[PDB]
């Protein structure tokens, strides 16, 4: 411990920067909520979505269903003579994704270029305070980080532990990343780093990019799935005991009628 600092630089740099980043994050979250706009949904697309949900629910929950009705559903969906998915065809948009290009694009897109706006804020903050020493980090650091860490102090003998305001605010950004969700909730959009990146639950889950292709894919998926009546096994309950109905029947006396 050395480099005795003033008590006026801690009350005019640390607290201001902390409040600045806190309120910047909160303002960003509130503005993100405000700017959110609804997307128009057409009735045909809605019906397509509901049919997709129906077929997916049939795929998921198909064990607890009569075999005759299950085959009737599957025929109605398939129906080689007419076919609902076969005849009903909407407009088709020419595509562009390709196998190798999209396989690579999965990584090329990513979220690589989402740090620059925070770098702009850090640059402005460092521009305001040219020669300053905010705090020291207990973690030992290597001298090859000193140019990025100090960036404005002409000292070669000094250690890299003493950080500037730029890295101070940079670490302040991710320090409250998990703290923002504490006051807001699980779905938090106050991340200062990802400013332009849209983070939301997502309006209109269903995205039928190619209605016909999705129709055919579900048509073959419903042909692949088998039928196994999970109701046919009723003998397990046959030889058992009934004591839970004695269970809250004891605790159903205690409540009277209002």
């Amino acid at each position: 411990p050395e480099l005795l600092l003033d008590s006026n630089i801690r009350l005019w740099v640390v607290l201001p920067i902390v409040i600045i980043t806190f309120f910047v994050g909160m303002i960003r979250h509130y503005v993100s909520i405000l700017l959110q706009s609804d997307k128009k949904l057409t009735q045909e697309q809605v019906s397509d979505s509901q049919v997709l949900i129906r077929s997916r629910v049939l795929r998921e929950n198909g064990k607890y269903i009569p075999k005759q009705s299950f085959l009737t559903r599957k025929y109605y969906f398939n129906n080689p003579e007419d076919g609902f998915f076969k005849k009903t065809k909407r407009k088709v948009v020419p595509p562009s994704p390709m196998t190798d290009p999209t396989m690579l694009t999965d990584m090329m897109k990513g979220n690589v270029t989402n740090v620059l706006p925070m770098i702009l804020i850090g640059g402005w903050i460092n521009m305001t305070f040219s020669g300053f020493v905010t705090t020291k980090v207990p973690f030992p650091l290597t001298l090859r980080f000193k140019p990025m860490l100090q960036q404005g102090i002409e000292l070669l003998t000094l250690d890299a532990s003493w950080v500037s305001s730029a890295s101070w605010y940079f670490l302040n950004v991710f320090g409250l990343r998990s703290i923002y969700s504490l006051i807001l909730g699980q779905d938090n959009a106050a991340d200062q780093s990802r400013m332009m990146q849209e983070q939301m639950t997502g309006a209109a889950m269903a995205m039928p990019a190619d209605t016909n292709k999705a129709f055919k894919t579900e048509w073959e998926a419903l042909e692949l799935t088998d039928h196994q009546w999970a109701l046919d096994d009723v003998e397990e309950e046959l030889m058992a005991k009934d004591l839970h109905f004695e269970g809250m029947f004891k605790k159903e006396l205690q409540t009277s009628i209002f």
Partner: protein, 100 residues
């Protein structure tokens, strides 16, 4: 076990993460108040996390099978991000008191 509700699971996970982040935040303040070296500080953070996990298991005790399907998230969960938010409050009060 045949049918599982996502709302209850989400609530359980949210509560778990909330306590994990709060305990980590206070662990950072304690270490910053005392002032130690990096190795000892990281060991102390790990010890605090282990104590929190043990208390979390003690909270459930019996009938825990209905509450949590497994125990891996209880032991290993939010160890890196929690450390990221703990390092901030460790050095926040460290240099505020000693350096200043």
């Amino acid at each position: 076990p045949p049918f599982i509700s996502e709302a209850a699971v989400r609530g359980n996970a949210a509560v778990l993460d909330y306590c994990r982040t709060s305990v980590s935040a206070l662990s950072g303040a304690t270490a910053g108040i005392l002032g130690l070296t990096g190795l000892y500080g990281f060991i102390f953070y790990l010890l605090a996390s282990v104590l929190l996990s043990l208390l979390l298991i003690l909270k459930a005790g019996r009938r825990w099978n209905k509450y949590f399907k497994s125990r891996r998230p209880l032991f290993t969960g939010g160890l890196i991000g929690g450390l990221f938010t703990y390092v901030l409050f460790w050095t926040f009060l460290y240099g505020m008191v000693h350096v200043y």
